[PDB]
Amino acid sequence: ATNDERCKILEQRLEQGMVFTEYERILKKRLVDGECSTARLPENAERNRFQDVLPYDDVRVELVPTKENNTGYINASHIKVSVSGIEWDYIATQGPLQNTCQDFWQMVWEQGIAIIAMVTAEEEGGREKSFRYWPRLGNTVTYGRFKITTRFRTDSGCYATTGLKMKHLLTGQERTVWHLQYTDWPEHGCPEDLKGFLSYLEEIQSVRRHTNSTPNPPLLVHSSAGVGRTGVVILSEIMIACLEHNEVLDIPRVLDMLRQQRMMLVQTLCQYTFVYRVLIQFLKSS
């Protein structure tokens, strides 16, 4: 029940408004070896949603080079953290563009991805935040050598689960990909329903566990920019796992480690304070 001491500390820090000082001291990106030269190539300009939100060279997801994409470039970062003995493996990526759908599915295939955690809407405020890279039911699409079929979509209130089949058109191999989309989460803000977000995290945790039981692949997390709401998901799941290991909690240490793998994770104070609220409620129900 040492979680009780953690929950008081967290509630007090939030209640007294000491969260901000902690958050604003965390650097947004690497100080050194922060080169994003491949991402900055003129040839890759159309592949970035924002020319300043970029993967670092040494952790970018490298696609096998193709005719259409010689550098095999996608705006996506490997995120590998070890926190309290747990080795976490994610890929964090931006929302696909019309012209990066083949790249996105090539990454899904090559990296062995079984679960997509989508935490953006397709459209918000009249703007595209993610291209519709998977088919709409009523049910198949082809991007280069990958055929994607939507089997079903089931709504769980705050999020929806879509069963996808992905087929390699040159080998005939097929794989199931589970698409878990949180549907009401404004960009730069927080989920509307805190408990709904916890149930979304619970479903990601469950499906990862059970698909692993049947080299485990990274979880693919994406938003629009691939840093804000993506960062909330990753930092929340890591910190929740920390709650069982007695070791002293150090959220800004963890977020700093994460931003060493992909810049700008967790864009706003409300997103960071939301992670505190998530942990408090998780501990309040333990």
Author numbering: 878 to 1015, 1019 to 1094, 1100 to 1171
Give me lines lifted from the publication on this model:
Because of the presence of a WPE loop instead of a WPD loop in the phosphatase domain, it is often considered to lack phosphatase activity. Combined with biochemical analysis, we have found that PTPN21 PTP is weakly active and is autoinhibited by association with its FERM domain.
In the 2.0-Å PTPPTPN21 C1108S structure with a phosphate ion in the active site, the electron density of the phosphate ion and two nearby water molecules is well defined. The phosphate group is 3.3 Å from the hydroxyl group of S1108, and the oxygen atoms of the phosphate group hydrogen bond to main chain amides in the P loop. The scissile oxygen forms two hydrogen bonds with two water molecules, one of which is the “catalytic water” (WA1). The water molecules themselves are coordinated by Q1152 and Q1156 in the Q loop as well as E1067 in the WPE loop. The invariant R1114 residue is held in place by electrostatic interactions with the inorganic phosphate and E1001. In addition, R1114 forms a hydrogen bond with the backbone carbonyl group of W1065, which helps to maintain the WPD loop in the closed conformation. Close examination of the electron density revealed that C1155-C1070 in the open structure formed a disulfide bond, while C1155 and C1070 in the WPE closed structure are free with a distance around 3.9 Å.
